[PDB]
Amino acid sequence: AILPVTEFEEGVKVFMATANGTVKKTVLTEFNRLRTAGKVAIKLVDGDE
């Protein structure tokens, strides 16, 4: 659905996500440092959003 771009991850950079159903959440980028094809979830998107 959405692919943002990141130059290099940093210390206190806070990641901001926002769904089509008018619901938003803010997450810390340090929990996305090295996934390795890892299907880590971010939100419990309710319904079709």
Place this chain on the structure above:
DNA sequence: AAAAAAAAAAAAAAAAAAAAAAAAAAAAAAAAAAAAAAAAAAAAAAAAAAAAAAAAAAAAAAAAAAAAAAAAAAAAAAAAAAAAAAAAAAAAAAAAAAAAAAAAAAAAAAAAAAAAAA
């Protein structure tokens, strides 16, 4: 009894394979850190709810950037020819369960033999 094929003699042509010994790399299979994910507790920011409020869409109307018309000119994209990449359709296959034929153990009983008694 006729036909056909194997095998063996001896000088010629031409091939193939198993291990030892050390040191390095490359596959390939395991424990074991390490982090997602999930179940089950308490816990706490958000919607609700209500009263109270004032900031931006309406409305008048000028005017100033505009989208259609006209013209000239540049040349992107579309369809027709060929030439490569990459994936389903269909057919084939090597182990693999099923069946059938030959080797080893079995005793019942007797022929021939060896041995000895009176």
